[PDB]
Amino acid sequence: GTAQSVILPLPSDHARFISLRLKDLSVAELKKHIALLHSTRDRLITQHPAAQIKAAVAFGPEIWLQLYKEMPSGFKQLAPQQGTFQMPVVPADVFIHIASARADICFALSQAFFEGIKDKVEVLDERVCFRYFDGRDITGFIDGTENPQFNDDRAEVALLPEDSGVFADGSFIFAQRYAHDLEKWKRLKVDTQEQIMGRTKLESIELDNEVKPENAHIARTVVEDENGEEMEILRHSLPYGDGKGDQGLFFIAYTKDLNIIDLMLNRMFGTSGDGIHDRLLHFVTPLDGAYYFAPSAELLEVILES
Amino acid sequence: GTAQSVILPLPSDHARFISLRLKDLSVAELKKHIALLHSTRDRLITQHPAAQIKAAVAFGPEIWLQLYKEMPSGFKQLAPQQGTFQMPVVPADVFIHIASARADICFALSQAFFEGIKDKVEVLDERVCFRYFDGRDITGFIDGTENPQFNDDRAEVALLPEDSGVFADGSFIFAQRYAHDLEKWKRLKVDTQEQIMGRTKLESIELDNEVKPENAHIARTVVEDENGEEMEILRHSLPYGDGKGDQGLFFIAYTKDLNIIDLMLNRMFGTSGDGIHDRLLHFVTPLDGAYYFAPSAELLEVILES
Amino acid sequence: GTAQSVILPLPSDHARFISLRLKDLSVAELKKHIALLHSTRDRLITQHPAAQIKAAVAFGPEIWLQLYKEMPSGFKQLAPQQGTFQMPVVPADVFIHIASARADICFALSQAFFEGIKDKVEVLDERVCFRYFDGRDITGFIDGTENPQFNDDRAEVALLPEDSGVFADGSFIFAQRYAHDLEKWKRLKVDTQEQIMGRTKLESIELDNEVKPENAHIARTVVEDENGEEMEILRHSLPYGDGKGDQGLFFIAYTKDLNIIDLMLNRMFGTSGDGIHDRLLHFVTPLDGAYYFAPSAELLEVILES
Ligand code: HEM
Ligand code: HEM
Ligand code: HEM
């Protein structure tokens, strides 16, 4: 098997994305506080069964081996990008994806995990996110058009397969917060923004092959395998922002093969070898970034009980 | 496998039903514009996952062989009724069933199909339909009481089985628009209208065998095989009308065996051999009628890619 | 297989719980009126598919063998308690659990069953029940926290397994109305109420083992098999009351093994052998109580058609 509960369902209106380092927290204390998160999750589900209360807990490469003495195949840390643009890496031990139809429930789950250990861990970010109008990024463009939509497709794209042993129905998480320069963006003509993205702004209709430039965002993030077959990821990104400061997109993807995300990042930032970079990177900036492993619910339970 | 998306779910509040002949449109152009419909369908699903965006595309027996080289078993055109009342047959090459919780989305899918080809095809009808109060026909009687209701029952009744090969999860459509003579109908006592339909008006309680006439509508549309077991169809009929002109029911059924609909129509129009016809035909009039085959979503995709 | 429709879904906002003895009603008449209940249920489902229209019909052990040739293994009548507190048994021939999102639908189903037989049966109770604020008992404590929640868990706990043959997907019902003494309850400090229940009042957080007393309600109702595994039941209890008179909880549980309920009641009322009783029983009084068997929907259909 069973994916953790946030991965497969369609996105809810509210989320919290948490990345942290253990600092003074022990592995046993971490298990206790994941169990505390689960306890409050379970309790509120019984009280609010329509509130779409969902979560995933995932782990960095180093702490994972402290929980389970075997790596999933291909698990590794994200590598920085030194291309036309720079992409940073900020390693984190624990990632928590909380989501619900309600902002107060998203907070309740975070509160439950952190109760009594606020000063024992080092939280890199606890990002509050929200659906933004009709599923748009704050550029005004719809985000998610080519994301897998059917349940079975979402599972096939995101989840490790049955012959991964205990790692089956786990998933690799790539999480990276972007901050937008909307003032620079808003000076562009709409036609130009559509050239940068590769889809139309109002409708998200894909631009024709003649009209879409090679450096458009979705030209760079569409990737094929050796046989020329398209390779996909399951995105769960959500906007965030404050009027006073950063505003942008919290990018997150679930995948059964981090090599797919490596390739897209190479092509966006300009390290793929073909001399091209994503023109959208002239208007948005990544501020963190890491890779994690989200076990299945059954494997997570084994870890908590060990 | 997969039935086309409109067949199995319970009916939505809004629909459009389209019958057309290719006229000047080429088979290649037809595949292009189905794909355009599918493209707008898919895009709007992503943006409105709760809007119940559904459709089926189906083909007449004459054009099907130009799209696929094998004929599903039992596929033939609707035959005329030389009965007490006459039933017209108006062949069409393409039938399109569009449904949604929202009227604007129904329009958007039709607009997507027709963009740039309005004068190349011969549209027989594009009927806007709506759920009418608590699922009633404009006679005031509830329509659907004995329709299969469970998902499994609906699939069993409407869909070709696994042994049909490529044709599995396809379905045959019978579509026929009716105009009602409400002036005549409303001159009846309610007790008489209940005699004519075979259920009570307010509640749709079935009349007892002692009270139900042999020429009541549901006495004629209940049919059984050689072993006395009832044969069923999956109706998706919906009211339509304008105050200024025609008002009625757009009748449509999905079935895995067109012979069942042949038998019901024979009993209705008075050619089954017992000399009885449906008294309801004194108050409603068929204005067209045809049979079609709706492939599975997989087979349709193969047709589109071919 | 198919459990009767009310068992597995999460609870709706309104219910009616009916217990009766046949008195002058014949077995044939009983089947007729169960069929009338089913007919009205089916008809209303078609008109209100979102109104959560559900029911279970179940039978006492005394009448079951008049309806079917074989007893499900272990079926028996409730036994009385003579412990710290007394528990009479009030046997009944037929139990009906009616539920819906709407009170009028609940009445409609009861009306349909009873039409024309009100003076033929001996109705012991027809209790109108309602969800009380956020799923609470009128004590103010949330009721349901440790109930099975996932559909598959609820099925495993409540339903007879496949090796029960024709009884597979049947369920045993224990139904028992309680009246509360709220004036006595409300004189307690909340911390004492939490001692009595074993969970916190506002949040239903379980009390730590060191603070939960041995005679707390959930200390008595948490029961363990010989191999150390906790034995569960599926509760569907709902509050009832009138300002002028009795107010309380209509307790009802579905289980695959009545021996589980036996042990729970023994521990609560003080006859289990450890000399302890449930302190909650100082504030609530049982007013009836009996065991029933709810067949699968298919087995129920066999009984109706025989
Ligand atoms: C602030 C940063 C970003 C913004 C505003 C953004 C926005 C968008 C938009 C508007 C689309 C088209 C609609 C859609 O199909 O979802 C899209 C597509 C996509 N983006 Fe991004 N994106 C960002 C960063 C990223 C990153 C870091 C990746 C990781 C490699 C990524 C991967 C993808 C993918 C895989 C698609 C689907 C393309 C396809 O298959 O057609 N995006 N994005
Ligand atoms: C103006 C045209 C029609 C009207 C107003 C109409 C109306 C109704 C009504 C009020 C019912 C009873 C409620 C229900 O069980 O759905 C019904 C049932 C039914 N109708 Fe029609 N109908 C029309 C045409 C047709 C046609 C052309 C067919 C088939 C060729 C058909 C097939 C059926 C069937 C199979 C049932 C279910 C009967 C049963 O199994 O009990 N109807 N219709
Ligand atoms: C007026 C009478 C009763 C009241 C007010 C009451 C109230 C409660 C409350 C507040 C809880 C804790 C929340 C929960 O887990 O659902 C609970 C749990 C429970 N009750 Fe009762 N109850 C009553 C009678 C009974 C009876 C008669 C039985 C069985 C013979 C029973 C069996 C259980 C069980 C099995 C649990 C779950 C315990 C666990 O596994 O943690 N209850 N009840």
Distance CA B118, CA A208 (A): 23
Distance CA C119, CA C116 (A): 8
Collapsed DSSP state (helix, strand, coil) of residue B64: helix
Cα-trace Rg, chain C = 19
CA distances from A264 to A87, A90, A271 (A): 12, 19, 10
Q: What is the largest CA-CA distance in chain A?
A: 58
CA distances from C18 to A67, C38, C42, C59, C93 (A): 53, 15, 19, 12, 11
The coordinates were experimentally obtained by X-ray
DSSP string, A170-185: -EEEEEEEEEE-HHHH
Place of tokens 């933004």: A132
Distance CA A280, CA A282 (A): 5
Beta bridge partners of B127: B17
Specify the amino acid at residue A110.
S
Q: Contact B193/B182 with Cβ under 8 angstroms?
A: no
Residue A186 Cα to chain centre, angstroms: 26
Resolution expressed in Å:
1.9
Distance CA B43, CA A35 (A): 39
Residues ≥6 apart with Cβ < 8 Å to B152: none
Measure in Å the smallest separation between the Cα of B1 and chain A Cα atoms: 13
Question: Which chains, if any, share at least 3 CB pairs under 8 A with chain B?
Answer: A, C
What 8-state DSSP symbol labels residue B32?
H
Q: What is the dihedral of CA A21, A25, A27, A33, to 10 degrees?
A: -90
Distance CA C104, CA B305 (A): 53
Distance CA C175, CA A193 (A): 66
B10 with C47: Cβ contact below 8 A? no
Distance CA A207, CA A146 (A): 13
Distance CA A135, CA A133 (A): 6
Q: Contact C78/C293 with Cβ under 8 angstroms?
A: no
Q: Contact A271/A83 with Cβ under 8 angstroms?
A: yes
Copy the structure tokens of residue B173.
Answer: 């459509």
B42 with A149: Cβ contact below 8 A? yes
Number of domains in chain B: 1
| Residue C95, φ and ψ in degrees, nearest 5 | -120, 135
What 8-state DSSP symbol labels residue A64?
H
Question: Does residue B200 belong to the interface with chain C, where contact is any CB pair within 8 Å?
Answer: no
Which of C144, C99, C125, C106 lies closest to C18 in space, CA to CA?
C125
C204 with A43: Cβ contact below 8 A? yes
Specify the amino acid at residue A88.
P
Residue A139 Cα to chain centre, angstroms: 19
Distance CA A66, CA A69 (A): 7
DSSP string, C179-242: EE-HHHHHTS-HHHHHHHHSB-TTT-PBPPTTTS-TTSHHHHH-EE-TTSPEE--EE--EEEE-
Distance CA B268, CA B270 (A): 6
- A122-130 and A14-21 as β-strands: parallel, antiparallel, unpaired? antiparallel
Question: Does residue C205 belong to the interface with chain A, where contact is any CB pair within 8 Å?
Answer: yes
Instruction: Kindly give the number of the ligand 1 atom that is closest to the alpha carbon of A264.
Output: 30
The CA angle A49-A53-A59, to the nearest 5 degrees, is 150
**How many angstroms does the Cα of residue C1 sit away from the middle of ligand 3?**
29
DSSP string, C226-268: TTSPEE--EE--EEEE-TTS-EEEEEEEEES-HHHHHHHHHHH
Distance CA C122, CA C142 (A): 34
Each residue of A207-219: b (16+ CB within 10 Å) or e?
beeeebeebbbbb
Question: Does residue B140 belong to the interface with chain C, where contact is any CB pair within 8 Å?
Answer: no
Q: What sign results for the dihedral spanned by CA atoms C105, C50, A132, B103?
A: negative
Q: What is the largest CA-CA distance in chain B?
A: 58
Q: What is the largest CA-CA distance in chain C?
A: 58
Collapsed DSSP state (helix, strand, coil) of residue A169: coil
Q: Contact C272/C88 with Cβ under 8 angstroms?
A: no
**Residue C143 known to be catalytic:** yes
Beta bridge partners of C58: C95
| Residue C152, φ and ψ in degrees, nearest 5 | -70, -35
Which of A178, A185, A184, A193 lies closest to A248 in space, CA to CA?
A178
For A154, the domain range is: 1-305
Q: Contact C187/C196 with Cβ under 8 angstroms?
A: no
Distance CA C172, CA C291 (A): 7
Closest ligand to C-alpha of residue C247 is 3
Alpha helices per DSSP H over A48-148? 61-67, 103-114
Copy the structure tokens of residue C67.
Answer: 């309806």
Copy the structure tokens of residue B118.
Answer: 């309005």
**How many angstroms does the Cα of residue A177 sit away from the middle of ligand 1?**
13
Distance CA A70, CA A299 (A): 12
Q: Contact B85/B271 with Cβ under 8 angstroms?
A: no
CA distances from C3 to A174, B155, C54, C167, C169 (A): 43, 20, 11, 10, 5
**How many angstroms does the Cα of residue C217 sit away from the middle of ligand 3?**
7
Q: What is the dihedral of CA C201, C204, C208, C213, to 10 degrees?
A: 50
Place of tokens 């009042």: C201
Residues found in chain A: 306
B145 with C43: Cβ contact below 8 A? yes
The kind and range of the H/E element at C15 are strand C14-21
Distance CA A94, CA A306 (A): 18
Question: Does residue B45 belong to the interface with chain A, where contact is any CB pair within 8 Å?
Answer: yes
A135 with B45: Cβ contact below 8 A? no
**How many angstroms does the Cα of residue C143 sit away from the middle of ligand 3?**
7
Measure in Å the smallest separation between the Cα of B95 and chain A Cα atoms: 25
The CA angle A142-A145-A146, to the nearest 5 degrees, is 145
Distance CA A143, CA B140 (A): 45
Which of C115, C96, C128, C93 lies closest to C36 in space, CA to CA?
C115
CA distances from C80 to A46, A130, C87, C262 (A): 33, 56, 5, 10
Distance CA C99, CA C10 (A): 11
Closest Cα to atom 18 of ligand 2: B218
Instruction: Kindly give the number of the ligand 1 atom that is closest to the alpha carbon of A174.
Output: 29
